[PDB]
Amino acid sequence: LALRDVAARQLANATKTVPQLRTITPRWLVRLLHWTPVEAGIYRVN
Amino acid sequence: YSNPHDQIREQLRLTIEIMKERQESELINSREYGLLNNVAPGQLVHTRNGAP
């Protein structure tokens, strides 16, 4: 009988990932539009 | 809405103007300090006819 796997695993680091969110979408529309800046929050289209 | 005038800057500017008006009023009229309350007896004159 030798050292076990769980007992040996008590001395090991796990690789932890950042939390995964399944509702993330590629959001293509935001990538496809052209964005113009509005200096003070008002945009008049003549 | 901070272009071309900063909104916080103007808000604080008008606040400080009102506060300094109140400060002058208290320099004249406060009950703790204030010129009209800290005038010694004998330093108070009265008009003779009412008009200055």
DSSP state at residue A18: P
Are B28 and B36 contacting, i.e. CB atoms less than 8 angstroms apart?
yes
Residue A42 amino acid letter? I
| Touching B: A residues 1-40, CB under 8 Å | 39-40
Q: Give me the resolution in angstroms, 1 decimal.
A: 2.9
Chain A residues with CB-CB distance to B2 below 8 A = 40
DSSP state at residue A42: -
Cβ separation A39–B3 shorter than 8 A: yes
A32 to A23, A25, B13: CA distances (angstroms):
20, 14, 43
DSSP state at residue A25: -
For residue A20, give how far its alpha carbon lies from the nearest alpha carbon of chain B (Å): 37
Chain B residues with CB-CB distance to A41 below 8 A = 1
Are B7 and A40 contacting, i.e. CB atoms less than 8 angstroms apart?
no
Closest CA to A39 of B2, B9, B11: B2
